Amino acid sequence: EVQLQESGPSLVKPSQTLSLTCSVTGDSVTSGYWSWIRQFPGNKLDYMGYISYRGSTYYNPSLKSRISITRDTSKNQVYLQLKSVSSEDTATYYCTYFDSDDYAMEYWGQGTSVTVSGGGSQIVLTQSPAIMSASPGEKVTLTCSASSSVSSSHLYWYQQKPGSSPKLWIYSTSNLASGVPARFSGSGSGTSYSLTISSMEAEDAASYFCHQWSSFPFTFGSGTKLEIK
Ligand SMILES: CN[C@@H](C)Cc1ccccc1
Incomplete structure (x- = not known):
């Protein structure tokens, strides 16, 4: 009932900025969080952050100062920006939707692959x-x-x-x-x-x-x- 689809470049040069878009389609929602989660080669999953239904954000301390998650609600989109990438940021990136009024459901995009050449x-x-x-x-x-x-x-x-x-x-x-x-x-x-x-x-x-x-x-x-x- 919510579909999610990630897009952006499949390749990025070190020190550049990575920009991805998550296109949300399906039923309207009255709450919840759009989270970016990435999966490294070898399959380790890494929780980046979220933007809530009220536009509140949380960022993994490990990424803070490099990451930003924004929304264009008119376009039903959510964005990821991560600055000063390195080969450590090579992964498949997923956007996902979750509503804590309902613990039993979580929706994941198809995922997009990206390769790079706090406290x-x-x-x-x-x-x-x-x-x-x-x-x-x-x-x-x-x-x-x-x-x-x-x-x-x-x-x-x-x-x-x-x-x-x-x-x-x-x-x-x-x-x-x-x-x-x-x-x-x-x-x-x-x-x-x-x-x-x-x-x-x-x-x-x-x-x-x-x-x-x-x-x-x-x-x-x-x-x-x-x-x-
Ligand atoms: C269960 N998987 C969690 C990532 C869903 C989530 C997202 C944002 C805030 C709270 C909860």
Whole structure:
């Protein structure tokens, strides 16, 4: 019901400015946040910042002073500007929409790839093993250990398959999002969380990322790639 689409140059020279546009289409909204999230090669996700429905912004401390997120509401667009890029800014950039009156839904654009030729603190989310293979029919358990405590309402899981964006999979530790087979489950508390498939199917092979938005900047685990034997 909200579609999102990112565009801008696929290549940028060091020290230049990167400018992307997120085109919002679909139903009108009365609240929420448009966030820019990027994914590095090797798949680490990085929360950049948001602009709210009231035009309030939050920027990852790591980017502050380089980043700005703006809106052209007449054009239903949201913009990202990041100045003084380096090869460290090479990634696929996604814009996303979320409304905290509803924890169960989050919308992601298709994502656009960009290649380049503060002071703060963050919760680190650890997912081990990085890669795992299971046979069809096995009960599978993936874990997420947070370096500091996280509210269980704000611990979330995402599935992603090659060539496509992360999809909201579990929200608030244990609730399956729309689209998710009920063979999935999640539990945990404090700094220790797990996702479970009662019975592994071929379609479950994918990367899974955990995510907390209990503390600012929100962070993602580096994922477990789940393969089929
Ligand atoms: C659950 N994923 C979070 C990034 C959604 C979000 C965005 C902005 C503000 C609050 C919450």
